[PDB]
Amino acid sequence: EVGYDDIGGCRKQLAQIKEMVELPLRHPALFKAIGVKPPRGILLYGPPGTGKTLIARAVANETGAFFFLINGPEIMSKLAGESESNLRKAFEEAEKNAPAIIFIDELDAIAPKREKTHGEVERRIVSQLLTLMDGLKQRAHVIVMAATNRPNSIDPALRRFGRFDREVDIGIPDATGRLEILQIHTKNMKLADDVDLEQVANETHGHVGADLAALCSEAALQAIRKKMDLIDLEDETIDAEVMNSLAVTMDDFRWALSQSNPSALRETVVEVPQVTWEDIGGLEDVKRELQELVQYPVEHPDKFLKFGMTPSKGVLFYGPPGCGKTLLAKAIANECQANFISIKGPELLTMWFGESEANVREIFDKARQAAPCVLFFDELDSIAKARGGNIGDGGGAADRVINQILTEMDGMSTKKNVFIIGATNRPDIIDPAILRPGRLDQLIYIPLPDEKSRVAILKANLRKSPVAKDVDLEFLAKMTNGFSGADLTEICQRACKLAIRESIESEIRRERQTQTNPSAMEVEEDDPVPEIRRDHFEEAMRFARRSVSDNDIRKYEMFAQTLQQSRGFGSFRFPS
Amino acid sequence: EVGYDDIGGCRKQLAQIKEMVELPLRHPALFKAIGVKPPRGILLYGPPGTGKTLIARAVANETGAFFFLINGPEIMSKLAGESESNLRKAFEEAEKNAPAIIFIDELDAIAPKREKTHGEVERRIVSQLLTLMDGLKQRAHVIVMAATNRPNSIDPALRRFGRFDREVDIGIPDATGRLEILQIHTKNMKLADDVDLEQVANETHGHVGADLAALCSEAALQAIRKKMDLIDLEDETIDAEVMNSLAVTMDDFRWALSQSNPSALRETVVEVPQVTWEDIGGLEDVKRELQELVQYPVEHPDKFLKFGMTPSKGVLFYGPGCGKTLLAKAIANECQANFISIKGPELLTMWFGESEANVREIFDKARQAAPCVLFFDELDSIAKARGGNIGDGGGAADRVINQILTEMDGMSTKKNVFIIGATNRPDIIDPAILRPGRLDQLIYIPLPDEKSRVAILKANLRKSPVAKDVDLEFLAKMTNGFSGADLTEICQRACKLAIRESIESEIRRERERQTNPSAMEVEEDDPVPEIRRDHFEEAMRFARRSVSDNDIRKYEMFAQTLQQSRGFGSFRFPS
Ligand SMILES: Cc1cc(OCc2nnc(SC3CCCC3)n2-c2cccnc2)ccc1-c1ccc(S(C)(=O)=O)cc1
Ligand SMILES: Cc1cc(OCc2nnc(SC3CCCC3)n2-c2cccnc2)ccc1-c1ccc(S(C)(=O)=O)cc1
Ligand SMILES: Nc1ncnc2c1ncn2[C@@H]1O[C@H](COP(=O)(O)OP(=O)(O)O)[C@@H](O)[C@H]1O
Ligand SMILES: Nc1ncnc2c1ncn2[C@@H]1O[C@H](COP(=O)(O)OP(=O)(O)O)[C@@H](O)[C@H]1O
């Protein structure tokens, strides 16, 4: 049957559910001699196709509890006045086979009322379901798990104490989980040796477990269409050996990925960033300060408690564009192995234009659920720029979105895990309230990368590309007196583009030469340009440009010295 | 059974309910010979999981009244046309066992109609319930108590005279009540000696009684998972001695608190502030004036009545991080009155959302929790949002301030709510706020003095281990014009430096054993056990004055802009 092996994604909420349900189910007799209330209901919510029903079935099988599935529309499709009988009989039958697990798939259909509550019979169904759910006499060990797309879609009374008192957001699987899902979905098709499922997994961003299964099936169907159809040898049952002779090639998977259309790309991603400190070449003072502020409270919470100091839970990065603030935030999140949530400027601008700031509440709740997390508000000054910056609106710096963010931060800190990081290229226009204590008070300045930092940035950008050892990278980094990280990335991309164009043009001509003059003996000399050379980099650097002018760096230096530690205490000595 | 001991939180509305219900129930025969109308219905409302049903059951048990529970959805889940029979039979049965208490849990389901009133059968249920509730012939002593999340959620006709004429807001338990709830929920698990339930209670802000019970259960489950599972010795019934051998450690409670997710952190807090005058080192003139304005009318109301003077019920603090919020908390604490704080973000939210009816709700909540000190922190936020130098084309009037003025004008009836306003920009504050009957008593909070600075440093460093070598008076005197916030920043930076040094040092020392395993283990304890002079010197190296002298000059201008003339200083009566 289905078990933990079938449950893919390694998303680490299956472990939480296990810890939740073993003792109530794995050790049911224990609770008989101990006075404790187990989890009467667990609300699994997330994007559709994430395997919530699969997870519930696997838990039921691995714990031995009698699994009962109450399909939402199955009862809803039944005639009014007798569907209530179906729900009551389902609970009674689950009660009989104690311990039992009752799974309500698509719970947002039985009790969708969000206090709007249209209709008459559906109100009866929701109220009777409430009576049954609250009617659990704590006898036996029936655990009621329900599936819902979002927590707010179901009736709020279902979310109350004793009905569904604890919720788990399965969420979209990540690259590691996408790879494991691909492995589980590719185990009987005799996958080819060339295909590794790693490149596909990385390119598979935005898919869900159902999406991964559909992509694998589409690749298999492409393989079946490409071969074994030309022969057209078919019978009632295709020969096992004949079908096994085919191997799903990388090309088939690539085409399937091109024909994927993932079912929820837009959904926000809660993922441990893969970026590491290696990608950023320097910022040692900044790196150490970030390590302090974030890592120290958790690695050594006892020492923070000993001195009675509450660590700051907000940091605001300020600096010129393209210097690596987003990368620095990702790296700091990676070092602590905490989930990273990034709120770019377009999202804030959308909330501001639409006059919908309640999304800030939802974003903060999501960050709270995925703890430990690093809630990063990238380019937080976007709203101020949108309203102006030199003259702007007649009013002050306060705006709806920033006010909601401040309210959530003030109401935050309770969680002890969410850490707010803010990045802004225009510190002058940022609202001052953002910098007050209890908010993003720790201001960190990210300067233009140094020569060593520039070398590291070039190496990180060119790690994947084949770069000839002849081209000296230290010389190029030193040559770039004030290039930003974005400028270095542009130079590397232009060099790669030049190399790609030259290689394409050359092999194309070489193919004409064989077509025009068919050689008697075929002897390919391989690639005329196998790796990026000095001339490519020289031509690319010919177009190198400094995006960040020295005047805006001067303004940042002004603000930095606008956070000046006075000029009279530098020699402070105690009287002794 | 359940009684007052089970009812935790010490939130002091259980006492009010007791005073409400003893004589109607504890002395039912008394009302037979005396012509008086007892409380026919009591509406208990508050956040879910606050123990309203528990409170009703405890009152019923402790008074001997026959408790009847009419679950909201229990009747609502029944078939239309026969649920009305269930409600009528419930009232008749409660009538038979006089005296009896009928508890309607989740009343917002039987009669949710807020004049929207969707559907047909639910209108019948609400009207029939109204007929029954108003149909109490004052015979027998059935008391109908109902539970609801908010007063406005239920049908307004239920709120009318004779149906539910008096309401009690149980509200979220406070630190003292959170601690007592933890004690009641931790009494049979054999709590460990290291765990005290005091630190957990302080860190437990935002939880409700149900949340506290869930946290305790989660800690117990963590303890059960950590131990007794490794051995894996299990049978049909776990041995009592084996299970008793385990003790819930502080670490388990800490993890549970980390995994709490309290079910209503956002809900407004009505709590007696723990801040005391000790935290503020000075402001003796301000302290005495605040004591006068707030405490004197209540401590000696008779003397206020004798002279026919109505004490001012509004005070506006103006000043540069100087402790206005702390001063308001201290004044509330001295009078032992509930404190409600409305920070600027809330006002800005009401202004941006064009929802000023929340001011009415806030004032009603303050009125219910009397005696209370309704503090409007940073009241000038809306004016700043609209500008301040040029601003909008219109005047200083805005929607939120206008609603606040309307509520204040309609206030004073309660005789208990006291409005305190704090503003860092007195120039832009609306003048109507300062008219008589409003926050007229303007109090200026200046930058802390040397003695005040010493007190602020001591308060900030009370918890942290500070070596006696570091002289605090010298540091306070050295800081010529540091604000309270600046002193707090200096103390926090010193603590951060000490923490980093201690962490780095013990980390190296651990390498030292790992690299060179010593033959005899002899830990020398902590290399930095308390904050020293060098830490404070390095921290003060980064000390900064947040408040410039020009803004202090503007505050001095406004202060002398409330100048008591210049010709009456020598006023003498003719004699
Ligand atoms: C001991 C303590 C821990 C804490 O939390 C620690 C923590 N855990 N997970 C996280 S989050 C995750 C980590 C990486 C990404 C984010 N954190 C955390 C906390 C603050 C800043 N960054 C992380 C808070 C406050 C305290 C205390 C300090 C003084 C006193 S007294 C009365 O003066 O003696 C009482 C209590
Ligand atoms: C006697 C009186 C008491 C009063 O109320 C007293 C009071 N009780 N609780 C509170 S509130 C709580 C206390 C700490 C936090 C808040 N207060 C109160 C009142 C005003 C200001 N602060 C507190 C009002 C007005 C009067 C009177 C004055 C003159 C006349 S005559 C016709 O000229 O002879 C008639 C009536
Ligand atoms: N991590 C996974 N491992 C194996 N199958 C998965 C996984 N995630 C999703 N699926 C696929 O998703 C299909 C249906 O999705 P389902 O489990 O019902 O979730 P939901 O009810 O939210 O749509 C299943 O048949 C299963 O094959
Ligand atoms: N102060 C308290 N003392 C003991 N238990 C409490 C307390 N507050 C809440 N609870 C717990 O809350 C549980 C259910 O909450 P309840 O009393 O029904 O309030 P509500 O109906 O508003 O949700 C109870 O089983 C009880 O254990």
Short mmCIF file of C-alpha atoms in Angstrom, two decimals, chain A residues 116-438:
data_model
loop_
_atom_site.label_atom_id
_atom_site.label_comp_id
_atom_site.label_asym_id
_atom_site.label_seq_id
_atom_site.Cartn_x
_atom_site.Cartn_y
_atom_site.Cartn_z
CA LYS A 116 -21.69 35.03 3.81
CA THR A 117 -23.43 31.65 4.03
CA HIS A 118 -25.76 31.63 1.04
CA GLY A 119 -28.64 29.18 0.84
CA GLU A 120 -30.54 27.17 3.43
CA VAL A 121 -29.62 23.48 3.28
CA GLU A 122 -25.89 24.18 3.24
CA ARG A 123 -26.32 26.05 6.53
CA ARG A 124 -27.90 22.88 7.94
CA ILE A 125 -24.98 20.80 6.65
CA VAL A 126 -22.40 23.15 8.18
CA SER A 127 -24.21 23.32 11.53
CA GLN A 128 -24.72 19.55 11.74
CA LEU A 129 -21.08 18.97 10.81
CA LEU A 130 -20.14 21.43 13.56
CA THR A 131 -22.28 19.49 16.05
CA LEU A 132 -20.64 16.20 15.05
CA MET A 133 -17.12 17.62 15.12
CA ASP A 134 -17.67 19.24 18.53
CA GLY A 135 -19.63 16.13 19.53
CA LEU A 136 -16.53 13.96 19.76
CA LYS A 137 -16.82 12.68 23.34
CA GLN A 138 -13.00 12.26 23.52
CA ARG A 139 -13.73 8.53 23.59
CA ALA A 140 -12.01 6.26 21.09
CA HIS A 141 -9.30 7.89 18.98
CA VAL A 142 -10.98 9.09 15.77
CA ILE A 143 -8.85 11.87 14.27
CA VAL A 144 -10.60 14.13 11.75
CA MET A 145 -8.23 15.52 9.11
CA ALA A 146 -9.61 17.87 6.46
CA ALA A 147 -8.23 19.29 3.22
CA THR A 148 -8.80 22.88 2.07
CA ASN A 149 -7.12 25.19 -0.43
CA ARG A 150 -6.85 28.05 2.08
CA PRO A 151 -7.62 28.35 5.80
CA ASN A 152 -9.99 31.30 5.31
CA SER A 153 -12.14 29.50 2.71
CA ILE A 154 -13.83 27.19 5.24
CA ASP A 155 -16.34 28.34 7.84
CA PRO A 156 -14.57 30.12 10.73
CA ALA A 157 -16.42 28.02 13.32
CA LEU A 158 -14.58 25.00 11.86
CA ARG A 159 -11.30 26.75 12.71
CA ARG A 160 -12.30 27.19 16.38
CA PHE A 161 -11.04 25.23 19.38
CA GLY A 162 -11.88 21.52 19.36
CA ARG A 163 -13.09 21.35 15.74
CA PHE A 164 -9.83 22.05 13.84
CA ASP A 165 -7.40 23.49 16.38
CA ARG A 166 -4.15 22.95 14.45
CA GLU A 167 -3.31 23.55 10.80
CA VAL A 168 -0.49 22.43 8.50
CA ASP A 169 0.33 24.15 5.20
CA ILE A 170 1.69 21.43 2.93
CA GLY A 171 2.61 24.06 0.34
CA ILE A 172 4.35 23.68 -3.01
CA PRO A 173 7.25 21.18 -3.05
CA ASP A 174 10.72 22.67 -3.47
CA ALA A 175 13.61 21.74 -5.77
CA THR A 176 14.72 18.99 -3.39
CA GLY A 177 11.11 17.90 -3.03
CA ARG A 178 10.45 18.31 -6.73
CA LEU A 179 13.39 15.98 -7.39
CA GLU A 180 12.12 13.43 -4.87
CA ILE A 181 8.62 13.64 -6.38
CA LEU A 182 10.14 13.01 -9.80
CA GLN A 183 11.99 10.00 -8.40
CA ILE A 184 8.79 8.58 -6.90
CA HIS A 185 6.86 9.26 -10.12
CA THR A 186 9.72 7.83 -12.23
CA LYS A 187 10.39 4.36 -10.83
CA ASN A 188 8.69 1.87 -13.20
CA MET A 189 9.29 3.48 -16.61
CA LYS A 190 12.94 2.36 -16.82
CA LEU A 191 14.34 5.87 -17.04
CA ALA A 192 17.24 6.33 -19.44
CA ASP A 193 20.84 6.79 -18.33
CA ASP A 194 21.28 10.18 -19.99
CA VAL A 195 18.29 11.63 -18.12
CA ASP A 196 19.23 12.45 -14.53
CA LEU A 197 16.04 14.10 -13.19
CA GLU A 198 18.24 16.78 -11.56
CA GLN A 199 18.24 19.31 -14.41
CA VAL A 200 14.53 18.69 -14.93
CA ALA A 201 13.95 19.17 -11.20
CA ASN A 202 15.76 22.53 -11.19
CA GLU A 203 13.87 23.68 -14.30
CA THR A 204 10.63 22.36 -12.75
CA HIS A 205 10.02 25.43 -10.58
CA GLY A 206 6.30 26.09 -10.18
CA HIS A 207 5.02 22.51 -10.51
CA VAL A 208 3.18 20.54 -7.85
CA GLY A 209 3.20 16.79 -7.24
CA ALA A 210 0.28 16.39 -9.63
CA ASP A 211 2.11 18.63 -12.10
CA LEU A 212 5.25 16.51 -11.77
CA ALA A 213 3.26 13.32 -12.39
CA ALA A 214 1.58 14.90 -15.41
CA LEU A 215 4.94 16.03 -16.82
CA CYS A 216 6.40 12.55 -16.36
CA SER A 217 3.37 10.99 -18.05
CA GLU A 218 3.63 13.47 -20.93
CA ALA A 219 7.32 12.63 -21.39
CA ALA A 220 6.47 8.92 -21.40
CA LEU A 221 3.76 9.51 -24.00
CA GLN A 222 6.20 11.48 -26.16
CA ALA A 223 8.64 8.58 -25.97
CA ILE A 224 5.87 6.17 -26.96
CA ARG A 225 4.89 8.43 -29.87
CA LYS A 226 8.45 8.90 -31.14
CA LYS A 227 9.21 5.17 -31.24
CA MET A 228 7.28 1.89 -31.41
CA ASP A 229 4.70 3.75 -33.51
CA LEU A 230 6.86 3.78 -36.63
CA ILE A 231 7.04 -0.02 -36.49
CA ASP A 232 3.27 -0.09 -35.82
CA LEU A 233 3.53 -3.66 -34.48
CA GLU A 234 0.63 -3.73 -32.01
CA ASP A 235 -1.48 -6.48 -30.44
CA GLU A 236 -3.99 -6.87 -27.62
CA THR A 237 -1.17 -6.45 -25.07
CA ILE A 238 2.12 -4.80 -26.01
CA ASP A 239 5.09 -7.05 -25.38
CA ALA A 240 6.88 -6.20 -22.15
CA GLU A 241 10.34 -6.60 -23.68
CA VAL A 242 9.46 -4.44 -26.70
CA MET A 243 8.14 -1.65 -24.48
CA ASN A 244 11.14 -1.97 -22.14
CA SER A 245 13.54 -1.48 -25.06
CA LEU A 246 12.62 2.21 -25.13
CA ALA A 247 14.31 4.69 -22.80
CA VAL A 248 12.88 8.11 -21.95
CA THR A 249 15.47 10.53 -23.31
CA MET A 250 16.34 13.99 -22.03
CA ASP A 251 14.77 15.51 -25.14
CA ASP A 252 11.36 14.04 -24.28
CA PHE A 253 11.53 15.45 -20.76
CA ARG A 254 12.60 18.83 -22.13
CA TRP A 255 9.62 18.91 -24.50
CA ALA A 256 7.28 17.91 -21.67
CA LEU A 257 8.68 20.69 -19.50
CA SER A 258 8.06 23.08 -22.40
CA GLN A 259 4.47 21.76 -22.41
CA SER A 260 3.91 21.86 -18.63
CA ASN A 261 1.89 24.97 -17.69
CA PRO A 262 2.32 24.53 -13.92
CA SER A 263 -0.90 24.82 -11.93
CA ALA A 264 0.06 27.65 -9.53
CA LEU A 265 3.27 29.39 -10.58
CA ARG A 266 1.98 32.60 -8.98
CA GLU A 267 1.62 31.02 -5.54
CA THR A 268 4.16 32.41 -3.09
CA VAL A 269 7.25 30.28 -2.50
CA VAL A 270 8.50 29.41 1.00
CA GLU A 271 11.90 27.84 0.35
CA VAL A 272 15.33 27.61 1.97
CA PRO A 273 17.51 29.64 -0.43
CA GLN A 274 20.36 27.73 -2.06
CA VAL A 275 22.56 30.83 -2.18
CA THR A 276 25.68 30.65 -0.01
CA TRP A 277 28.28 33.09 1.27
CA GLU A 278 30.57 31.90 -1.53
CA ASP A 279 28.43 33.73 -4.09
CA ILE A 280 29.19 37.02 -2.31
CA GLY A 281 32.90 37.82 -2.26
CA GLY A 282 33.34 39.86 0.88
CA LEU A 283 31.17 42.05 3.10
CA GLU A 284 32.98 40.46 6.02
CA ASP A 285 31.90 43.18 8.43
CA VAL A 286 28.37 43.00 7.01
CA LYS A 287 28.52 39.20 6.97
CA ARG A 288 29.56 39.05 10.62
CA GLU A 289 26.93 41.60 11.65
CA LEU A 290 24.20 39.65 9.85
CA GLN A 291 25.46 36.43 11.43
CA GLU A 292 25.23 38.09 14.82
CA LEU A 293 21.77 39.59 14.45
CA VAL A 294 20.14 36.50 12.97
CA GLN A 295 22.11 33.39 13.94
CA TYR A 296 23.27 34.28 17.47
CA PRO A 297 19.82 34.42 19.16
CA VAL A 298 19.01 30.89 17.97
CA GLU A 299 22.41 29.21 18.10
CA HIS A 300 22.96 30.54 21.64
CA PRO A 301 19.55 31.61 22.98
CA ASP A 302 20.69 30.85 26.52
CA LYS A 303 23.38 33.53 26.44
CA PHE A 304 20.92 36.10 25.10
CA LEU A 305 18.56 35.20 27.95
CA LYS A 306 21.36 35.43 30.53
CA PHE A 307 22.06 39.12 29.83
CA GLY A 308 18.35 39.96 29.55
CA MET A 309 18.73 41.37 26.03
CA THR A 310 16.13 40.89 23.31
CA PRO A 311 17.84 40.65 19.91
CA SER A 312 16.63 42.94 17.15
CA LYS A 313 14.30 41.19 14.71
CA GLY A 314 14.64 43.72 11.88
CA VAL A 315 17.49 44.76 9.58
CA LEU A 316 17.35 47.33 6.77
CA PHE A 317 19.88 47.03 3.95
CA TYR A 318 20.63 50.30 2.15
CA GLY A 319 22.96 50.75 -0.80
CA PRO A 320 23.28 51.27 -4.54
CA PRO A 321 21.35 48.96 -6.89
CA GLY A 322 22.96 45.70 -7.92
CA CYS A 323 25.31 45.30 -4.96
CA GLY A 324 23.83 42.03 -3.69
CA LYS A 325 21.35 42.91 -0.94
CA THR A 326 18.87 40.25 -2.06
CA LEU A 327 21.73 37.76 -2.39
CA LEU A 328 23.01 38.71 1.07
CA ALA A 329 19.57 38.10 2.56
CA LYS A 330 19.35 34.73 0.81
CA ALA A 331 22.83 33.80 2.06
CA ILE A 332 22.00 34.73 5.66
CA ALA A 333 18.79 32.70 5.44
CA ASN A 334 20.75 29.75 4.03
CA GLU A 335 23.35 29.84 6.81
CA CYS A 336 20.62 29.57 9.46
CA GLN A 337 18.78 26.98 7.33
CA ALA A 338 15.56 28.97 7.73
CA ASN A 339 12.80 29.44 5.17
CA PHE A 340 13.09 32.57 3.05
CA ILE A 341 10.13 34.66 1.88
CA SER A 342 10.79 37.54 -0.52
CA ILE A 343 8.27 40.34 -1.06
CA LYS A 344 9.46 42.24 -4.11
CA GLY A 345 8.40 45.79 -4.92
CA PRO A 346 5.82 44.86 -7.55
CA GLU A 347 3.77 43.07 -4.87
CA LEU A 348 3.82 46.12 -2.59
CA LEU A 349 2.90 48.39 -5.49
CA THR A 350 0.02 46.08 -6.38
CA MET A 351 -1.26 46.18 -2.81
CA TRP A 352 -0.96 49.98 -2.79
CA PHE A 353 -2.65 50.60 -6.15
CA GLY A 354 -5.42 48.12 -5.37
CA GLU A 355 -5.95 49.57 -1.88
CA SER A 356 -5.72 46.00 -0.52
CA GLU A 357 -3.35 46.04 2.45
CA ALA A 358 -4.95 43.04 4.17
CA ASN A 359 -2.55 40.99 2.07
CA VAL A 360 0.16 42.14 4.48
CA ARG A 361 -1.69 40.29 7.23
CA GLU A 362 -1.81 37.17 5.07
CA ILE A 363 1.90 37.48 4.20
CA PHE A 364 2.88 37.83 7.85
CA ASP A 365 0.71 34.85 8.82
CA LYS A 366 2.39 32.76 6.11
CA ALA A 367 5.82 33.83 7.35
CA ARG A 368 4.77 32.93 10.90
CA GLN A 369 3.66 29.45 9.83
CA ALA A 370 6.97 28.76 8.05
CA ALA A 371 9.26 29.25 11.02
CA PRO A 372 12.23 29.71 11.13
CA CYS A 373 11.87 32.21 8.28
CA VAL A 374 13.52 35.38 6.99
CA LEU A 375 10.77 37.70 5.76
CA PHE A 376 12.56 39.97 3.29
CA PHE A 377 10.85 43.11 1.95
CA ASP A 378 12.90 43.76 -1.18
CA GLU A 379 12.93 47.34 -2.49
CA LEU A 380 10.62 48.59 0.27
CA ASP A 381 10.95 52.20 -0.97
CA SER A 382 8.90 51.49 -4.11
CA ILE A 383 5.71 53.08 -2.75
CA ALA A 384 7.54 56.28 -1.78
CA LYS A 385 9.03 56.50 -5.27
CA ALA A 386 5.59 55.87 -6.79
CA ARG A 387 4.19 58.80 -4.81
CA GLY A 388 7.19 61.00 -5.65
CA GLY A 389 10.43 61.50 -3.74
CA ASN A 390 11.45 65.08 -4.50
CA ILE A 391 8.06 66.75 -3.99
CA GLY A 392 5.69 63.76 -3.88
CA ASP A 393 2.19 63.93 -2.49
CA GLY A 394 1.04 66.70 -0.18
CA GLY A 395 0.98 64.29 2.75
CA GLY A 396 3.90 62.82 4.64
CA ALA A 397 5.82 59.60 4.15
CA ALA A 398 3.06 57.46 5.70
CA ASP A 399 1.22 55.19 3.26
CA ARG A 400 -1.30 52.36 3.58
CA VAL A 401 1.06 49.47 2.84
CA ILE A 402 3.88 50.67 5.09
CA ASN A 403 1.37 51.38 7.86
CA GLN A 404 0.03 47.83 7.61
CA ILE A 405 3.59 46.47 7.63
CA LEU A 406 4.32 48.49 10.77
CA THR A 407 1.14 47.22 12.42
CA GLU A 408 2.07 43.62 11.63
CA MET A 409 5.63 44.12 12.89
CA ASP A 410 4.35 45.73 16.10
CA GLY A 411 2.02 42.77 16.52
CA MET A 412 4.88 40.46 15.60
CA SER A 413 7.90 39.43 17.71
CA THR A 414 5.51 37.06 19.48
CA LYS A 415 6.53 34.26 17.11
CA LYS A 416 10.22 34.62 18.05
CA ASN A 417 11.16 33.15 14.65
CA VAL A 418 10.22 35.52 11.82
CA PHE A 419 13.03 37.96 11.00
CA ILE A 420 12.29 41.02 8.85
CA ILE A 421 14.95 42.18 6.39
CA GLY A 422 14.42 45.34 4.34
CA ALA A 423 16.33 46.48 1.26
CA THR A 424 16.03 50.00 -0.13
CA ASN A 425 18.01 51.93 -2.74
CA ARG A 426 16.55 55.28 -1.56
CA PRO A 427 17.04 55.49 2.22
CA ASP A 428 16.25 59.21 2.22
CA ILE A 429 12.62 58.69 1.16
CA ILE A 430 11.95 55.68 3.40
CA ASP A 431 9.41 56.35 6.14
CA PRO A 432 11.18 57.20 9.43
CA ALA A 433 8.70 55.09 11.41
CA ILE A 434 10.25 52.02 9.76
CA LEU A 435 13.50 52.71 11.63
CA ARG A 436 12.04 53.16 15.12
CA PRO A 437 12.95 50.58 17.79
CA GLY A 438 10.98 47.36 17.43
#
